[model samples]
Target: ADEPIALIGLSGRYPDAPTLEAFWENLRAGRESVREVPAERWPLDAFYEPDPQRAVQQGASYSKWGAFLDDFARFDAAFFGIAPRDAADMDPQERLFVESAWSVLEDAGYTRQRLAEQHASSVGVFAGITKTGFDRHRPPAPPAPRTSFGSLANRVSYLLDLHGPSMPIDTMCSSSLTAIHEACEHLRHGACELAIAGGVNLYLHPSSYVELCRSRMLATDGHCRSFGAGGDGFLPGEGVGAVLLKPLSAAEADGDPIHAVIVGSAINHGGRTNGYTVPNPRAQAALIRDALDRAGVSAAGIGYIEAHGTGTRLGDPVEIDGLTQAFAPDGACALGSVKSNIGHLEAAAGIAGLTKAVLQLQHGEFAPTLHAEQTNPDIDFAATPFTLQTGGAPWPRPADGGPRRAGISSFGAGGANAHVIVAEYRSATPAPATPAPSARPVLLPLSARTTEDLHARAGQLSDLLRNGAPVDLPAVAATLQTGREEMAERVCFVASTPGEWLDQLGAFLADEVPWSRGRVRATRETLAALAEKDELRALVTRWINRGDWHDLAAFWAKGMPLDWTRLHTPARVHLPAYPFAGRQFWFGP
Candidate 1:
């Protein structure tokens, strides 16, 4: 087996799901989230044409529906230290990218403070972004920062203060998948210990839809029938997604949550195709073989392949032909396409498929490919060893007893082909036993930038603990000490169990506590006292053991930096993300 790259954290907003959790729920139920274009994004009457032969129909879209994140107008500007002015002028693509990037980092259990407390060059960012109407659609105003193409990745690095190699990719639809591959490459070569790879696309203007429909690239039925025969073509979509990557060894050593492992990957282009924009099966098959070979595994070992099933007349067959050529047919492999669930996300397409695969691998099962019930007559499934998994079913365990592995494929219109082989990763080290939970009161701290936000944070965390998330109080307190940054608005309380924590948190949210206050100033002696280095570790440890925080509170009030060396237990497993208090910033006519 090859050294694996671990996918630790993931986050995104797509179609009917505002959160990652919702996205998976939608997937598990085999739901098609694409629907008629809401009145908010664009007016359908202006461009919708159901009958292609209509005498007046010239250049228009027959499909009125598209997958979109309904809350496009909302953004948590203050959360990421972004200015209202800068955030307003930023393209929504950039806005969601930063938000998504921050989320993925948190998902990896590394907050800004935790990351900044380490070497500045320890992390990097890679993003995929499609053309947006930022410059063309924005209202004229006094010039602020220009929204350039480079800003997609550059903004994330700048805003997050990331100092590692950073860049945006633009390989058409495969852009994000390329970005993910590059991030994995960086991690392997030590360019950065951890990397952020993702892509974002928003259907902001009606003009682009017209162009795609005119080219017959879009389906008239408003559905992305990736492997279906009844559908006319593919549908356009809007989405933003992100994932955090690290070497499996490092992630396991740090105790990070490992969703899946990237074993092998490859990328290539089909030069001088029969015509431009035509998919090449030979190149696609070769890419799959290259990735599988690089992973040191046989295609027979893979349970599924998330195909670039864009649902075109030619695209569907070419993708399957490539997979068939790469893997000799036994009819055991399954397929997934986000295009059917959320339509084609263009630059963000690969990450969506990647996310779906990760979720499937994590659950040890595969979800049905939405709107993919029928097999296209053009392609013969019986002739090949593949199956279009039409209903949600448990994935067959790999016969080799090796980890459950799957492959993800992405193809750009210009012949850029990328494939990644991912498998389950188990920790090499057994987990240390958790501290014995005695029947005693344990104090948990809560804080945020604003008093209102702090309460909101408390309520959010309360839900997570009570909602059956397997969390330990001691580990939670330890993570708060080592993982999260202490903000000014603070509250601390005693609880013995998850139920106790929930009650205490709700009481705090109701402001029924002596500790519920905001914006405390710090003294210089407390700041100077924090410099006592080794002496402070004992204090932090003591605070973790016994709920004594006199000095800890003082140092934390001044945002005292934790001597990360003092506490080096594997990072706590999958802490809930920070509560972003975002408000709607964008307006409409």
Candidate 2:
């Protein structure tokens, strides 16, 4: 069974490095990627109301901590052929996942059509995303429309022509690694011959930063010093990564070059832990043990352990205790966290660790853990029995003729824990690497509408794209009508264009589905019922909602209907999960 699963390729983007090679190089050099939040770009003042009391209580004047993407603003809407308004509506987190997956597939010498034919039914995608639509401004009005949770992972699957099970797992910090664990299950069940697993976290907006601050989870200063006594908290960072997983036997049979082999993976929730948000060492130890048991290996064989070392007093100590209890009883092992270099990537943090381990196995070099000047007194590093690799060294191997092994651990704020064991590929004969062709960018058209009337739709679309804002529908239609005569049906180009325009365009099309008449009729009937109901009418009266009746009518004709009475709502709202109304119902007072 181990013969069928192989890591054939990888790709990623992180702070300080746009490509995987650059990211690895930076890690090896022990460079810190965390930085202070830019006041001008973040504009925290804009996010708050003018009330002085509320502002002072919220501590709105403090500089937010966390490393964030600065290049998102430069992405071009026209390059991907998406209207500016539609592009603006997309979550940067989703865009990052889709782009990274596409790059990984291409790096593995696979095309969208080829991937579809090979594992259309089996190929699975699991993405870890923390914040969605992080850059979108919240309007000062009721009924704020937002992007859906499924939109991110769904778009990635659609863009890659992958038809397998697609899911966006949000398990706080452990999300990306949880996705990897899920992908492993799909492979184990023989549901898919291959899987694309990774995570993405983009904390560019002040709303998210302020929330972290209010919770006292952020570093007072923008510094991430994992395993160091001086460490205060972690600096949030943006990153995206993906690994190509195929069955070991299939890789051998298809002659696919194997990068690394996933030996075993497991996930468990910390039931009845400290109020659901506290870390549990006992649970973390159990998760690591389960993964080792599934891999059929003992702790002694584990060479490098990529611990989830978020730079915080409480988090770092708790994790160290967990690792100590899990592996110290067996023997000493090398340990470190990539967060020291890249900060905490939130959803993508686990994948970052996995990626570093994979690269170390391939290159036979363990990247140093930056900022570990002096181990924290709370963490008994010496007694913990694992040597934290503070500098570069060769990848550790088993004494027997077995494969070199590594363990990656990730724990979420909601008490979800996941761990995966990876080993070097073992085969008497290795397969030759196939050269992948250069990826060609797909050209798409950008059109928008602002008015209920169709004549001005085209103009609105052009203006929105040109001005970098939402456009009216009428103006968009008008521009499209005139440009349709001169524009070609399709255009081909490279991906080096300015402003992730092509990437954004691809994401928009993947999210937007064509409306049907039946769907629109169904939507209209539901809305009409709500409009006539006295209670609903009163609710609507409190909000100044504005939209065309025709659009609502079209929704009724095309949208699918569900039995609302059968649904059950939760008693209490949960953090992160309850923020989006699409996933849970909001109770009216």
Candidate 3:
């Protein structure tokens, strides 16, 4: 509780945004992402039953809309080294979760090759997911290796060869955030050093929507008008989100970029509510108080809240009451919900809220909750600590001048509830660093499974050079060698500047260029030397920069070792992800 947990890496594919940046842009701009159901999901007319007059309708939903992501049917299986035949037999949740996990790691600049070199601690994965029946499509596809709900988190460890605790949480709407909470506990208790956590939701079938609609859980207009008096209910949604976690100190020591710090978290149930799915304001208030107590911060310090705002008339007022009591009697705090932008994401809902809070902290801004134009008549802003955040505004710092902080709440159906405190980590000024000197040559290595893949990857690097921001060339080299998985085809570079690095990249893009490339295990003394870390970087730098190829060759009796954590830079920047080239693979209904 003293140091807090770091949220260092992020990745997601939301309603209309394909990447994390796009997701932030949508939120910051106050854009509404909910829309009519796309044809690809199902035939709309066959399932639509908009007329509420009819009490019962078979196989139909009162509303036919969702905050759906495009291209949900397709997955880049090849990028994850998954076989096409096996990929088709798997669920889309597994496919997207794999891609999402890798992207978040890439955002942290930690590829499988690079992670292998880290400290002896095992890596863990906690995924939040709902059990889904097949897209109910058949030729009755043969059983694949990754079709089970429990395998969701296990698959990542299996594919990446990670050794750590793996679990898939299924607490309904709060699932993903619950996974994150447990991942933090794993790190605090020494279960793992690095943890991958998040949750995903995709409504490939119409059954859930039909059920919610029948139960009057869905909005008539398919919009999440959270906290509005006249608003009916929440729309459904689809999304996948993830984050990489580590102890705050470990993250700093490892030189990872942090998105935010999780200061406190608590999970519980609504207990005996009036209805199985009904919200309990008392339990909700207690959950927030418990998290605040654990975080060592008072509710008054929070600048905003990413509410579990489903926008239902029955639920909104109760949540407002809970917020009023659990928080200080100050009216300065602001509140909003991502569901207002993208409809309720079911099992993935908690993760969506957490990711939104991370992005908000990173930017120090808050966006207006969508469809909440009118204030709820029952909720009074003047007397409570809550402010209905409409028309997005800058997130103000607490008057106490403490670090900016916010809370995210997620209450699952059938009672489970969770709250996490996100405190902005204000990194102190860093001392001047020792980047590779101009006189010395910096080494950068690249590799891929095939010669063609090597060429394509080089081209991507070339494009990065031309269009991307000015980057530390030497830092890139450290990440390239340690972060990338060295495949059969490889290219090595010795560059003194960005210009030289670009030229080498161009050469590889044009065609293969010869360089000293060998499997790491082949070398013994060098492997031992590399295992030791810092000194090894200088040794390689000393020999390579001097153009003493023969001495360097002799030193590396064979090549580098598979494991060594110290070579990493004091810091890393987010980089472009691997370009996937997956072939089509799926069975139709």
Candidate 4:
């Protein structure tokens, strides 16, 4: 059987959505994030000119709207072991990549120590970055390695000491999708056991905006009305997205949380186009067909299409035509675009779309596309296989008994076109029967680099438990103990149920002593007696097998080395990443 590339993890920072959970809610509610350009990015009053001709002539943007990320310049320099002076010199793009990459790995329950212990040095990093705007704000200085686009991926590889290839790709708008394709190829060919693939874009300079304005590629209405009537063009957005990848078999064996599976992908160029930047609809159709063939699925099998809908008058129709030519489906399939919610991210657009598709597959529902109610006059919906998903709807299992499948497209302004076919991962085995409740109290451990961060982490976890999501207390405990990185400041609690754990966390957050108390003494003679009698080893064994958490407190307080892996079965669940100190670090005042 052919194995697909499993999407094991995801992390990103999008406009108005600080976390994936927030992003999901925004999508579920069909929220539009576009607004007047924030003062932090640049003074819009100085750069904005409402008249398109005057704006281009004066080297300004005609549109003043954009989807911008807050705190893009903030980073925990000490956490990354970078001096503040050097951090200031580093490009925000590079810094954002490092931050997002660490979050994605942590979200997948892979820490640096764990990777090293498993000898997983063969990990690749592929980043998609087309432009650099950070250097434009600071005084001109000699070029440094940190400013190079290659540093976006290479820096992460160097920091993690991964032995696999590190590449920074630039295919313009399709860059991130192409990076995913390349990462999957490496996974398939045994070139790497794991891969980090994504893209980042920030509008730190006005020159980039002026260039887009000159080309008349920015919307005057300050919205990306994808597949809608009167669509003009897209507003630029800022985002950084990353995904962890592994082979399906490896991911399942490793017990990773599989977000989705990438069965096949294709990348092609629009040869002999009307212009260098103009899209070729025929080439787009060929790309989709090839991707479907490689995935070993008929076009009819796909239930959705995440189109590269930039909302331009010409681009929307061309993409629809391409989809019509490729599918020619007998049944209707839903279509939508993430750009409608968050404006075009340029190089990072592909990953945004990819992440949206994965979220849809994981949730078994389609997110709505804004401004999709009025259909584009150029494309006839009656003759096509696609319908605009103007509202949220459940994407139930196909009547034919096939898994839910979707195709994502990302076409570059300069002709590179990429398509990926992703299917929901339905485990061959049914869910394991829940084991009987344990007799002993559970051991829940949490740690952070600082006291403030520890409190913040506790607060976040408490909120998660408060949401009443049918959370497994043991799984949460194991995820804390084994999945996250240990730090200097730490806390341990022994509890019998979720209620007790919640009380403990709430008490800890409120600066009150938790309900549980340690009874074992950490005296030298007591330690000697337990070691000399071999009772400590036996106790650890019992603790691993029988959940003897009552005896764990003293050992944890003493900072003795303990094998956390044996604390619970393989049930690493998704949890929040570390809360970095959001201290500002930028190139200029």
Candidate 5:
């Protein structure tokens, strides 16, 4: 159980490499993957917006060193099975994403049958795409809502018949890594036994590139100098990556090649720490601590770190301080940025770091922080004992020859902090591994009419659970039913409002039901209550709100006038649920 998760397989495609091996080879050769834009295709002159006095003002400019794909037009059409004529009309970004996902899956040895056998019905697939070519090419009368927002993960999940959770996260640069954190949580909570987690971003055209230039986020010079002096901005890169994860026990039992065990993972918003957009060192520190605590490891135990080095004056120092505070009690670990090698992949940055970590742990070598000719004077790397590797060399293995361990951090522009701990897997001593016994169940009834009344009743029930009130099934049901008839949703949530609430609820539920409080029972009650509550009330409210009660009534047997939005919308508050309720409900469903 203590052994790290195994790294059975890894895959990535970046600027120089279309495959994992190519990517690794490029990394080891000490060659840069950046290149200038071809004058014929990306003429700087053509991008200038016409200004007065017969002069042109550059509204946005293309990157000179970032990776760009020229063959994507053909690749997209062929790989995604888009007919050539139709592909011409399709969004190039979406096409590339779909193809990249398939390539990554094939690279990871996830055959159709293997995916099916794992009950991947809940397997979460999350992808990030920053720019889509659709807006540029689609007919522009009045803009139509996008049919598909270049979501590769969804395409892959559908193509491969993965039934598990599928979502596309767009958090500017941190999308992929955030996706990874969420995917890890899903596995931990048994929402899905496995996940296809990664991100893909492709800039197939110059318009999108110019957009970055307009934002002043692009480097003035062509180079991306992550963690280096004179750093200005990031160089964009294109690629896709996917990592498969399962529970620690399941991974071992199934004999899958464990990459690193995901010891701990966490994410948090910057939360007004820096005017909402700036990276907040305090928030970063807190997120790292939470991850470490969940993983049951100290900062000292972390041997290396992959940083979210965007090469900005404000961002890099914030990250450095955060890492130093979290891990630099005595400065025991190494820190580096992968952006130096491949430029900033944006949505793919986290996976890029992860791919490198997997390789470092596997090969016992950490790659150099490329392009960092000079460290920033403002930040003290040594203060936290962070050693930034300057040259590619074999990373030393731990003295005990134990598993390699590292932390990967990604910070997004909109103030999201995400940290994940990965450790190289080692074979565990064989032992009897029994499933943890299930917990006892709790059942509470509810009665409510007005949605407000329902909320009140739910709140009261939450209080009872918090106080550990003795389970009185009849009373509990009666309390729950108060004001039950008012709402449209039939759902009654049996979860506590918080940890304190859980203690109270658990005591009462245990006292009353006395049966195994398995997660299944809680879910059944919650869903049943949610679905059954005021079904008729909701229909009436919807019609009345729209002033279409007559039409609604004509369509249905009965329709009453009521405001539906107020009735249906849950309160906008962070109400706590039983620990791991999301997992419980997701898995049970």
Candidate 6:
């Protein structure tokens, strides 16, 4: 029996949205991130030719638009144990993936050290990526191998010291979803107890644009209007996305915060298509059918379909046709594409869509597909259950009050196709709400590798509290104390209310906090002294239990691990991750 997998954590960096929180805002606001490619990416003037025919003939792109990240060259090499030279030599994709991997682990409340202590070698990494030798154009390249596609996944495993199978997958546009499918299977079969799966795509060289232009695969108008009239082609986009997966039973037993559950997934190739890159609708339908059967859920249960709507004239209709065949004709479901808002992320596109769907499910709302004002005549939406979601609405809860479910599809240019079924995870305990007033003060600890990083971290937490994030103060403290990996530079605050926490964080950011200044203290010796007397030890324990803020703050500053969970077994919630120092490192051409 194929059991569902729990997606406990996820993170992504997309065009104009650096954090998942920002990405969600952009999605809900229906923001279009596609614009003229940055001048720094490539020389648009040298590569741009307005006429599509002439541009293809001349090996130049007719479109100059794409969605790009803010800074691909920035990396915190020191944090990742990478040398400056090696960091410069490494591909941005490699750097981004590792950072995202770490963030996902953090989001899941599992640090690399924590996993090393617990799961150890059982964790796996399945990265989806294609080769992009951006550093190869260096004037005098080193003799060492710096750009291996396999290294993408291998690097994450190596850095995290994971022993599970690690490898990079290349299925072009479907790479990320294919990687997720592999990850789910691995978790189910015990190949790895947990998995990190996603993909990254970056356009560093103009030659990539030239190649796509030659194939006439890019949108000429620089807009991806998926499932809409004039859906000519897709625009290029670049980003990295990651998700942490484990068996649903294990996650539930461990009380892990579940974002969504992957009931089933299937990967297949479009065999013997009309063209080498053309998708076979029959095969697509079969893939979805098989996945649903494995999930043991009827197609009518799927409330939404995140289609592989590339906005291409041929691809959009064919994808819709396949979906129609997969589901009952009378069924009703909302349909949309992430590509319309963020352009096409190429290899990273699938994970992007998957993440969006997961977020939508979490919020019990859908996001509008941008630039799809009119439907493509070829889609025949009236003949099928699919209704293009131009304006998103609150997802209709099932009549039977079951979990809301959605299906995500990703089709590659080279015929590889993947589909996954994701359902909202509603725990027996309801989502955490505003905290009940606590009798004892909570210890809100923060730390980083450097004093500068500590300051930045404080500022981030301050902003989170100031913005009135929906998290109990105790849960926030517990998350900071236990969920995070301790660093040398540290500070702690004792607060019983959100306002007090905010004030302490504000003081720390303002450099006026009178607490333990980012330095190590003799916690072991202090603990030993306290242990010498049974009455003193009992008193200290009682103080800790009864809200002795000063004693707890002192102990935390000296690098002493406190029984944070002993205060209150609060559930770990997602918070902001470490703010990496964006030091520039790149061997640019």
C-alpha local distance difference test of each model? 0.76, 0.63, 0.77, 0.83, 0.60, 0.84
Q: Please report how far candidate 2 places residue 491 from its true position, in Å.
A: 16
Compare candidates 1 and 5 on lDDT and give the better one: 1
After superposition, which runs of candidate 6 have C-alpha atoms over 4 Å from their true positions? 140-145, 329-331, 430-435, 512-514, 521-547, 563-568
Q: In model 2, which range of ten residues has the least summed lDDT?
A: 572-581
Model 5 lDDT, residue 199, Cα: 73
Question: Candidates 3 and 6: which is better by TM-score?
Answer: 6
Residue-wise C-alpha lDDT for candidate 2, range 235-298, written one tens digit per residue: 7777878887887777666555467888888889888975767889998988888888888888
Candidate 2 regions off by >4 Å?
A: 1-4, 44-56, 59-63, 73-84, 133-145, 328-331, 429-589
- Stretches off by above 4 angstroms in model 3 are 1-3, 53-55, 113-121, 140-147, 431-441, 449-470, 488-569
lDDT of 1: 0.76
The estimated TM-scores of all candidates read 0.90, 0.68, 0.86, 0.92, 0.66, 0.93
At residue 372, candidate 5 shows an lDDT of 75
Return the top candidate by TM-score: 6
Q: What would the per-residue lDDT of candidate 3 be over residues 170-276, giving only the tens digit for each residue?
A: 89888988888888888888889899999989876667677777778888888888887776878888998888898999888888877789999988988997789
- Model 2 clash count equals 57
Backbone clash pairs for candidate 3 read 523-558, 523-559
| TM match of model 1 to true structure | 0.90
Which model is ahead, 3 or 5, in terms of TM-score?
Answer: 3
**For every candidate structure, what is the RMSD over all alpha carbons to the true structure, in angstroms?**
3.5, 16.9, 4.7, 3.7, 20.1, 2.9
Q: What lDDT is reached at residue 155 by model 1?
A: 77
Better of 1 and 6 by lDDT: 6
Tens-place lDDT per residue, model 5, 1-589, is 1223333345556777755556766777666777776553356556533322122134556445576544443343432344555544445455555555554443333455556656545666767655564444434343332326434566678776788888877776888889888877777666776777777666645676676776667776666677788878788877777776667676556544345677788899888863656778878988888888887787777778988888877678878888777764425467787788788887778888888777777668777777776887677676665877778877676775666788898888788768888887666544533642222221233222233433444555566545453443322332222212222322222322234334544454443331111112233345445535596557556655665523442322111222223322111111111110000000000
Candidate 1 displacement at residue 401 in angstroms: 1.5
For model 6, where is the 10-residue window of minimal lDDT?
136-145
